[PDB]
C-alpha cells in the first residue's frame, strides 16, 4: 500500500498541467518527491502498485485526483492512465463513512481553539491536519495574506498557476496528513478488524476483510463521480424561453400589483420580503392566527390560501401575490440565483450537478451547485417545462448524431417495504405479503380506521417518522384528540410495529424521563447497525424508525445503482457518452440514465430490476423489492 497526493494548476474543469506529487510507500517507509518533469515517472509508480496488487491512497482522489491524472496523462504525455477501482482508496470517503458523527464531537474541539471555525464541518485534508496535530501551516492562507501585503491582489485560487518549492513541500504536507488520517481510520475496529494490518495487504484482501460498507462506499463514490463527469444534458434555449415568459409575467404583475395599492420615508413595496404582505394584510383587516418563534406573523402558502378580507379587491389580489412568489421561486432557481441552472451549463451543453455520497449521516447523498434533487416536479406549475429541460434528447450522439433516449427507473414503494422487512420478524412476513398482495394503503386505512385511502397514505409516512398528535389529527380535520386515538388504534391492529420498537429498545438503550414539559429523551446506544454494518448514530428514540428505514432504503439504492452498472458493464455495454449509456442523476430511489438507442434503454430497465432483486437476495431481505422503468426523451416523461 502506498499513500500519495498531487498538485495541479486548477480544478477538474480546466486543469492543464501537473505540478508535483509525493508517494510514501509502507514497504520502503520513505517519501519520494516528483516535479513537473517527473510526471511520467509518477504515473509509472502508481502502475507498479497496481501490478503488485496493492493499494493507492488519495484524499478526494475518486472525485478529483484519479480522473485528473486520467485527463493530464492524455494531453501532456499522450498516454492512457487509468487506476482500477479495486486498487485505489479515498480517505475522504472513509472519513464521511466512519466519522459522520464528529461535529457533534468537535464542539469541545471548537471550544478548544485547536480547530478553525472555517473548517467546522470539513472532511478536507486541512481540516484534518489540525485534528492530528500535523498542521505546520496552510498553503491557502499563507498565500492570500502574501498577496495583500507583499503586492498585487487576487481573485480565486492563484496559488497553483505554477510550481514552487513551497508547493513541493506543502504537497508533502498534504501526504503525511493523508497517511495519518488513513491510520486513524484503520484504527477504528468497527470497520477494520484488528487481526489484519490493512497497511500491508493486497487489494483483494483489503476489500474482503473490511466491513461491507467500506467496499460499497468506494464503489459508490467512484460511480457518482462518473455521473458528475457524465452530467445532465441541458436545453439552455428552453429555460431562456421561460425566463422571458416569467419576467414578463413578473413585470406585468408588478405593474398590476401596484394598482391595488397604494403606498424620513419613501415607498416602493413589491411582493417580496416579510415587510410586504404583512404591511398590506394588516390594512385589509387580517388577524394573524399562527405566529413564529421570533414574533413575526406566519406568511406562508398555507395561511395565504385562507386569508379572508372584507375588501374584494384585496381578496382577489391575494391569488395574484400567490402567483408572484411562485414565479420568483422558479426564476430564482433557473435564472435569478447565485446557483441558478443557467450559470452551471458548461461548454458541452450539460449541467454537472455535484453529489456528496454517503457524506450524509444515514443514506441519501446531498446535491448542490445546482441541487439536481429539487427541480420542481411535473405536478407543480411550470415544472413540465423545467423537467423537459433535463433530458438525454438535449445531447446528440457524438457519432450517429441521433438524440439519445432517457430511461427513468425508481424503487417501487421502497420505504414501506423496508418497514415490512424489519417487522416480518414478528408477524412472520404478514405485512410483507400485504405489499405484494397490493393496496397496503388500503390495509393501513382499515388498521388505523381512516375515511379515505389518501388519508391513510399521508398517515403512514407521518406516523412512522415521529409526528405529533395534533398533526396526525389535522389529517381528518381534528386535533390531538382524534390524533392520539388514530395512532393508538393503528398500533393495536398492527402489533408487529410496536414489537419492532421492543427489539430496538432491547438492543439495548437507556430510559427516559419527563420534567415539567421538557423532553429529556436520553439514551445509552446512539448508533444503529445498518444493512452493510455501518454505524448510524440516529437521534433520540422519539423517532429513530425513520432513520432505520431511510438507512435501509438509501443503502439499498446505493448497492442497486452499483450492481446495475456492474451488470451493464458485465453484459457488454459501455459507460460514457462515447459508449452506450450514461448515469445522469441519482434521486433517493430513482435514477436518470442517458441511452444511445431506445433498445439500450430497454436493457437498462430490465437490468435495473435484476440488480434490485440481487440486492434483496444478497442481504436476505424479508420482503420483496421491485422497480418500474419508463422510457422517453427527458425527465418529465421518465417521471
Amino acid at each position: 500500500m502506498i499513500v500519495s497526493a498531487i498538485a495541479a494548476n486548477a480544478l477538474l474543469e480546466s486543469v492543464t498541467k501537473f505540478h508535483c506529487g509525493v508517494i510514501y510507500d509502507y514497504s520502503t517507509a520513505e517519501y519520494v518527491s516528483y516535479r513537473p518533469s517527473d510526471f511520467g515517472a509518477y504515473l509509472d509508480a502508481l502502475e507498479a502498485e497496481v501490478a503488485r496488487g496493492g493499494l493507492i491512497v488519495f484524499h478526494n482522489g475518486h472525485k478529483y485526483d484519479v480522473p485528473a491524472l486520467t485527463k493530464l496523462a492524455k494531453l501532456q504525455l499522450n498516454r492512457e492512465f487509468h487506476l482500477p477501482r479495486e486498487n485505489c482508496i479515498d480517505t475522504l470517503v472513509l472519513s464521511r463513512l466512519i466519522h459522520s458523527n464528529l461535529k457533534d464531537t468537535d464542539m469541545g474541539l471548537l471550544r478548544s481553539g485547536k480547530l478553525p471555525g472555517k473548517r467546522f464541518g470539513s472532511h478536507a485534508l486541512e481540516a484534518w491536519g489540525y485534528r492530528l496535530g500535523e498542521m505546520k501551516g496552510e498553503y491557502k492562507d499563507d498565500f492570500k495574506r502574501m498577496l495583500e501585503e507583499q503586492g498585487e491582489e487576487y481573485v480565486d485560487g492563484m496559488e497553483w498557476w505554477n510550481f514552487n518549492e513551497e508547493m513541493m513541500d506543502y504537497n508533502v504536507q498534504d501526504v503525511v496528513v493523508t497517511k495519518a488520517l488513513l491510520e486513524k481510520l484503520l484504527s477504528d475496529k468497527h470497520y477494520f478488524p484488528p487481526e489484519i494490518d490493512f497497511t500491508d495487504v493486497g487489494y483483494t484482501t483489503f476489500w474482503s476483510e473490511s466491513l461491507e460498507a467500506v467496499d460499497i462506499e468506494h464503489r459508490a463514490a467512484w460511480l457518482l463521480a462518473k455521473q458528475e463527469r457524465n452530467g445532465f444534458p441541458f436545453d439552455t434555449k428552453a429555460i431562456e424561453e421561460l425566463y422571458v415568459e416569467l419576467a414578463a409575467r413578473r413585470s406585468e404583475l408588478l405593474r398590476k400589483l401596484t394598482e391595488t395599492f397604494g403606498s424620513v420615508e419613501h415607498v416602493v413595496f413589491n411582493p417580496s420580503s416579510r415587510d410586504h404582505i404583512q404591511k398590506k394584510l394588516q390594512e385589509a383587516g387580517w388577524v394573524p392566527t399562527k405566529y413564529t418563534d421570533k414574533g413575526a406573523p406566519v406568511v406562508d402558502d398555507e395561511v395565504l390560501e385562507g386569508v379572508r378580507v372584507d375588501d374584494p379587491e384585496k381578496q382577489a389580489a391575494i391569488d395574484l401575490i400567490k402567483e408572484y412568489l411562485m414565479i420568483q421561486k422558479r426564476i430564482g432557481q433557473s435564472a435569478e440565483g447565485d446557483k441558478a441552472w443557467l450559470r452551471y451549463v458548461a461548454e458541452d451543453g450539460k449541467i454537472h450537478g455535484s453529489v456528496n455520497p454517503n457524506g450524509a449521516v444515514t443514506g441519501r447523498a446531498t446535491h448542490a451547485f445546482p441541487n439536481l434533487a429539487q427541480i420542481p416536479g411535473v405536478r407543480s406549475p411550470y415544472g413540465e417545462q423545467c423537467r423537459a429541460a433535463f433530458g438525454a434528447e438535449h445531447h446528440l450522439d457524438g457519432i450517429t448524431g441521433k438524440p439519445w433516449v432517457q430511461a427513468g427507473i425508481d424503487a417501487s414503494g421502497l420505504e414501506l417495504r423496508c418497514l415490512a422487512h424489519f417487522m416480518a420478524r414478528f408477524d412472520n412476513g404478514e405485512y410483507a405479503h400485504e405489499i405484494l398482495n397490493g393496496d397496503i394503503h388500503t390495509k393501513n386505512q382499515i388498521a388505523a380506521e381512516l375515511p379515505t385511502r389518501d388519508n391513510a397514505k399521508t398517515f403512514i409516512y407521518g406516523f412512522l417518522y415521529g409526528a405529533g398528535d395534533e398533526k396526525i389529527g389535522q389529517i381528518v380535520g381534528a386535533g390531538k384528540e382524534r390524533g392520539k386515538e388514530l395512532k393508538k388504534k393503528f398500533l393495536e391492529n398492527t402489533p408487529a410495529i410496536a414489537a419492532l420498537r421492543e427489539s430496538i429498545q432491547q438492543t439495548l438503550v437507556e430510559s427516559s424521563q419527563w420534567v415539567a414539559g421538557e423532553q429529556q429523551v436520553k439514551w445509552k446506544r446512539r448508533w444503529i447497525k445498518g444493512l452493510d454494518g455501518r454505524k448510524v448514530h440516529v437521534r433520540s428514540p422519539h423517532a429513530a424508525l425513520n432513520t432505520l428505514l431511510q438507512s435501509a432504503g438509501a443503502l439499498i439504492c446505493k448497492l442497486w445503482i452499483i450492481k446495475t452498472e456492474e451488470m451493464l458493464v458485465e453484459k457488454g455495454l459501455k459507460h460514457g457518452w462515447d459508449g452506450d449509456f450514461a448515469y445522469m442523476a441519482w434521486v433517493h430511489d430513482e435514477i436518470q440514465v442517458g441511452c444511445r438507442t431506445e433498445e439500450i434503454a430497454q436493457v437498462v430497465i430490465e437490468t435495473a430490476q435484476e440488480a434490485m432483486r440481487w440486492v434483496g437476495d444478497h442481504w436476505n431481505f424479508r420482503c420483496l423489492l421491485d422497480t418500474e422503468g419508463k422510457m422517453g426523451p427527458n425527465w418529465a416523461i421518465c417521471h
Binding site: 397604494g262 403606498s263 424620513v264 420615508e265 419613501h266 415607498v267
Partner: protein
C-alpha cells in the same frame, strides 16, 4: 382653525389659495410630528389673518408628498401663490415657528 387636505383638494386649497399656506406633511407614526401638532393648533389662532395652517397626512394621501420630494417629516412648506416660498423639516418649537413665519410674511 386648521385645514385638513386630501390629494384632490391640494391643488385648489393650497396652490390656488392666493395667500400664505403652511402645509404640515405629517404622519401618525412619527415622533417629532406629534410634538409639533399642539404648536400648529396655537399658530392657527394667532396667525388667523396673514397665514393659513394646513396639514396633509401622507398615509391617507400618498400622492402629494412625492411631488415635493419628502426626505424627512414633519415638513413645513410655506406656500405663496402656488409656489414654495420656504421649507423647514423637523419639530420646531413655538418660539422657532413664530420666528420662521414672521420672517417669510
Amino acid at each position: 382653525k386648521i385645514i385638513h387636505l386630501t390629494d384632490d383638494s391640494f391643488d385648489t386649497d393650497v396652490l390656488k389659495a392666493d395667500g400664505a399656506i403652511l402645509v404640515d406633511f405629517w404622519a401618525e407614526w412619527c415622533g417629532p410630528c406629534k410634538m409639533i401638532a399642539p404648536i400648529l393648533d396655537e399658530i392657527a389662532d394667532e396667525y388667523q389673518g396673514k397665514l393659513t395652517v394646513a396639514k396633509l397626512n401622507i398615509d391617507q394621501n400618498p400622492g402629494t408628498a412625492p411631488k415635493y420630494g419628502i426626505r424627512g417629516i414633519p415638513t413645513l412648506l410655506l406656500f405663496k401663490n402656488g409656489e414654495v416660498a420656504a421649507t423647514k423639516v423637523g419639530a420646531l418649537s413655538k418660539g422657532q415657528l413664530k420666528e420662521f413665519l414672521d420672517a417669510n410674511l
